[PDB]
Each structure stands twice: as structure tokens, then as C-alpha cells.
Amino acid sequence: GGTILVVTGTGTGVGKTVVCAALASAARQAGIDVAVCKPVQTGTARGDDDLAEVGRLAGVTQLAGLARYPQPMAPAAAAEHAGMALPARDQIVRLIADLDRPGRLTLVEGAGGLLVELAEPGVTLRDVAVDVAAAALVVVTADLGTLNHTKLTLEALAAQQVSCAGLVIGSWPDPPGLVAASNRSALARIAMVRAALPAGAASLDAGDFAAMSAAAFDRNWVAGLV
Amino acid sequence: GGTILVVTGTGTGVGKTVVCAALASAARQAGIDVAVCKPVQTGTARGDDDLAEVGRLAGVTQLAGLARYPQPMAPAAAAEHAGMALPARDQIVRLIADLDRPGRLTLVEGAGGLLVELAEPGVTLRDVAVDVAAAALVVVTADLGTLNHTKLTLEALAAQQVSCAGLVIGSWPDPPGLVAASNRSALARIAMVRAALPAGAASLDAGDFAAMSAAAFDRNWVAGLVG
Ligand SMILES: O=C(O)C[C@@H]1CCC[C@H]1Cc1ccc(C(=O)O)cc1
Ligand SMILES: O=C(O)C[C@@H]1CCC[C@H]1Cc1ccc(C(=O)O)cc1
Numbered sequence: 331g332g333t334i335l336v337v338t339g340t341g342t343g344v345g346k347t348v349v350c351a352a353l354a355s356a357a358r359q360a361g362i363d364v365a366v367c368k369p370v371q372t373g374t375a376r377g378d379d380d381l382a383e384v385g386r387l388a389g390v391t392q393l394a395g396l397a398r399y400p401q402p403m404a405p406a407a408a409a410e411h412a413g414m415a416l417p418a419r420d421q422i423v424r425l426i427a428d429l430d431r432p433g434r435l436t437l438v439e440g441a442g443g444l445l446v447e448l449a450e451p452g453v454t455l456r457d458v459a460v461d462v463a464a465a466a467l468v469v470v471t472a473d474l475g476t477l478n479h480t481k482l483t484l485e486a487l488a489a490q491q492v493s494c495a496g497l498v499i500g501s502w503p504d505p506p507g508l509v510a511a512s513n514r515s516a517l518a519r520i521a522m523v524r525a526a527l528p529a530g531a532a533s534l535d536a537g538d539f540a541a542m543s544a545a546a547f548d549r550n551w552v553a554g555l556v
Numbered sequence: 557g558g559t560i561l562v563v564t565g566t567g568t569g570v571g572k573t574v575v576c577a578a579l580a581s582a583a584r585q586a587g588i589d590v591a592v593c594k595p596v597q598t599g600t601a602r603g604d605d606d607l608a609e610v611g612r613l614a615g616v617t618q619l620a621g622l623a624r625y626p627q628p629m630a631p632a633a634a635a636e637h638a639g640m641a642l643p644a645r646d647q648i649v650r651l652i653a654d655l656d657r658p659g660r661l662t663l664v665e666g667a668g669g670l671l672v673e674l675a676e677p678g679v680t681l682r683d684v685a686v687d688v689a690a691a692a693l694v695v696v697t698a699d700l701g702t703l704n705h706t707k708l709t710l711e712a713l714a715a716q717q718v719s720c721a722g723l724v725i726g727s728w729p730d731p732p733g734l735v736a737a738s739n740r741s742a743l744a745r746i747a748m749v750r751a752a753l754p755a756g757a758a759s760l761d762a763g764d765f766a767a768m769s770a771a772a773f774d775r776n777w778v779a780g781l782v783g
Binding site for chain 1: 669670709
């Protein structure tokens with residue numbers, strides 16, 4: 331196999347997808363073959379499609395999903411609303427395992443934070459990460475409260491021996507501000523901050539997004555991922 | 557001693573203080589002697605004073621502070637900004653132990669969420685709860701994202717064998733939307749939802765607050781907290 335990395339976050343709406351896209355873009359620009367697996371998508375009624383964001387922003391074509399739920403809710407609630415079960419754990423893990431190949435960086439995107447249910451019954455992205463021996467990249471905010479949520483997520487990773495590949499600040503403000511600047515220094519004291527994406531990066535066109543991504547990450551770190 | 561409960565939250569601004577006030581009020585209405593302590597208060601330059609707020613709302617008079625910092629930031633950053641040190645672990649323990657008394661419910665209000673550093677080095681409200689054998693009451697929101705934060709918080713309590721006294725929804729919308737109702741149902745499957753404080757509870761006067769508080773908690777559960 332290659333390198334499997336779950337891209338999780340401290341919560342919902344913290345920039346997981348755009349960080350997934352940004353890392354994919356940087357990796358592809360380093361010559362790395364990149365696949366993204368998002369087993370479960372919700373909020374499809376309003377048009378959510380994080381795989382398409384990755385495909386458009388980063389140029390990834392190996393974009394694997396299993397289930398799509400109309401309502402913009404956590405997978406379990408969206409599945410309950412729709413009256414249909416979430417996928418099975420085996421579906422998700424085998425899909426990722428089949429995507430994984432030598433020389434490839436396979437990013438795995440869940441929904442919401444680390445402990446949200448992704449597959450029936452009650453299996454999370456952390457469970458999946460354990461099953462496929464992935465490390466976890468954790469997308470954080472720079473906002474008030476990020477320190478607790480980041481420490482909570484890192485503890486939960488370590489509790490099941492899922493290695494933390496670093497943090498990415500999903501949206502970095504301009505100009506920072508006292509709290510954002512303080513949080514960035516504090517976050518760097520608990521884990522490597524791999525990048526801090528400029529606020530609004532998710533709306534860029536493909537060209538600007540690739541330039542942003544290459545600048546966002548350390549070249550050597552990206553190159554060493556596989 | 558009596559019963560020590562730390563009142564924590566999934567994060568900042570989730571209603572910890574109002575919940576502390578609400579529980580204090582319900583317990584006082586049960587005849588339970590209540591003390592509330594706030595090891596670390598930040599935001600004094602903004603006028604933040606959670607003890608004064610619990611006193612105003614619930615009529616608690618036994619209010620013990622320790623460290624206070626001007627800036628409305630996490631304790632470590634507020635202390636750093638003030639050129640001050642955080643308190644030491646033994647100072648928070650002493651502050652709580654001095655309050656603990658048979659038949660008394662002592663509430664310890666944290667700053668931000670459970671894993672926030674309250675004492676150097678990296679000492680948290682969870683560490684303090686371990687030191688004083690306190691259970692933890694977890695204030696949650698009903699908003700999108702609460703489920704992950706609540707499970708993260710409950711796992712962190714269990715990782716150190718800190719009993720979870722239950723959850724309190726810090727603000728409950730009336731009427732609830734689809735997500736809030738789904739979240740409350742999902743929260744109750746995670747742990748006991750002891751109360752859901754009505755939105756705007758913090759704005760009530762002492763009489764309406766006391767009524768809301770007596771209505772918000774199960775009086776048997778409250779009385780059961782303290783022997
Ligand atoms: O991936 C995202 O964060 C954006 C999704 C868009 C639709 C709802 C988001 C999924 C989600 C929301 C709340 C919770 C919870 O833990 O309460 C778990 C997962
Ligand atoms: O008690 C509260 O939640 C209200 C305080 C008012 C001013 C800052 C709040 C404290 C705090 C903020 C962020 C974090 C973090 O983990 O980033 C930890 C603690």
C-alpha cells in the first residue's frame with residue numbers, strides 16, 4: 331500500500347474539505363498521486379459535494395464515495411431522516427483499502443468531527459483510521475475555543491493509537507487579531523501546524539487554489555508523505 | 557466532605573455559568589447548602605465575573621474565586637497577557653477543599669471546555685476533578701456540532717475515570733428546529749440530559765430564574781446529589 335491519511339477536524343464547518351483539497355493540490359504538485367475517499371456525504375439537497383470540491387480545486391480524479399444523504403445533518407441524523415441506513419464499516423474500510431496503492435496518498439474525509447458516526451453501527455472515522463492504519467491530519471479553527479477542541483481531538487486520536495500527522499488551521503484571518511495570533515502559537519505548542527489556509531480559500535478558482543496550496547504547506551513535509 | 561461537582565462544557569460560551577447558577581438555585585431550593593467557586597476568571601477587563609453572575613441569578617453567597625485576569629481569552633493566554641502566572645494545582649485543590657463540607661454541594665466552574673489549562677503546567681479541570689474526587693456536569697449546546705464535542709468530552713472524562721454527572725443543554729430553543737430536536741435526542745442516547753435551560757434564562761430576574769431552575773432539573777436527582 332501507500333499512505334492513507336484521514337483528514338478530520340475539531341468539529342463541523344472548520345475547513346476539513348478545503349484542507350483536504352489543499353493538501354491534495356500540494357501533493358499532486360509534488361508529483362504525488364492523490365486519491366480522496368469521502369464515504370458519506372450529507373446535505374446533498376442544498377448541493378453539498380465535497381468530493382467535487384476536491385476534484386475541482388485540486389484536480390484529483392480518484393474520488394471515492396459510498397452514500398449521499400439529502401439533509402444537511404450528521405450522517406446518522408441524515409440517514410434517519412431519509413429512512414435508510416448508513417453504509418457498513420466493511421464497505422468503508424475495503425473501499426479505502428482498495429484505493430490505497432504504493433506511491434499514492436489516499437486522503438479519507440469523514441463528516442463533522444472525529445467521533446461522529448459514519449457507518450452503522452456507531453463506527454467513526456477514528457475506527458476507520460485504526461482499521462486502515464491511517465494517521466490523522468486535524469483541521470482546527472483559529473477561533474476562541476479551538477484549544478480545548480484540539481486537545482480533545484488529539485487525546486481521542488492517541489487513545490486508539492492513531493498518529494497525529496499535524497494540524498491545519500482551516501481559515502486564517504486577515505489580519506489575525508489577538509486571539510487568532512495567540513491561538514496559533516498555542517496550537518503549535520500542542521502539535522505541528524502544517525498550514526494555515528487564508529480565509530476564503532474555498533472560493534478560489536483551480537489555478538489560484540493550487541498556488542495557495544503549494545505555498546500553504548512545507549514542501550519537504552508534503553514530499554515525505556509517501 | 558460533601559459533594560463536589562465540576563461544571564464543565566464542550567467549549568466556550570455554551571452556558572456553563574448559567575447552568576452553574578441554575579443547578580445552584582435548584583439545589584438551594586431543595587435545602588442543600590451550595591458553594592460555587594471559579595478557580596480562574598478571565599475577561600475582567602470586559603466585566604466578566606461568573607461568580608457574581610451565579611450570585612445574582614441564584615442567590616448563592618458562598619462564592620470563592622482565586623485567579624483573575626483582564627483579557628477575555630483562555631486562562632494561559634490571559635495570564636501571559638497580564639504578565640502573571642496561572643495558579644498552581646494545589647491552590648485550586650485548596651480552594652475547593654476549603655469549601656467542601658458534609659451536606660454541601662460545591663460547584664467548580666471551569667473556563668472554556670474540559671481540557672483547558674487552568675494551572676501550570678497543563679493542569680486541567682479534569683485533573684482537578686480527579687484530585688478532589690468530583691464528578692463532572694457537562695454543559696452542551698443543541699447546535700450543529702454538539703454531538704462530536706459531547707462525545708469527545710465524555711471520552712476524556714472516562715479516560716481518567718471522572719464520572720459524568722450528566723449533560724445540561726445550556727440554551728434550549730422554543731420551539732426547537734429539526735437539528736436541535738435531533739441533537740437533543742442523540743444527546744440523551746449519549747448520557748443523561750439533566751436539564752435543557754430555556755433560551756434567555758440568563759436574562760431572568762431572581763424570582764423567574766429560581767422558578768426556571770426548579771422546573772429545569774429533576775428535584776429527586778438534585779437532592780440525590782448530596783447526602
Ligand atoms: O462535514 C461537516 O462538518 C459539514 C456537514 C454539513 C451537514 C452537516 C455537517 C456534518 C456534521 C454536522 C454536525 C455533527 C455533530 O457532531 O453534531 C457531525 C457531522
Ligand atoms: O468560560 C468560558 O468559556 C468563557 C471565557 C470568556 C473569555 C474567554 C472564555 C475562556 C476560554 C476561551 C477559549 C478557550 C480555548 O480552548 O480556546 C478556553 C477558555
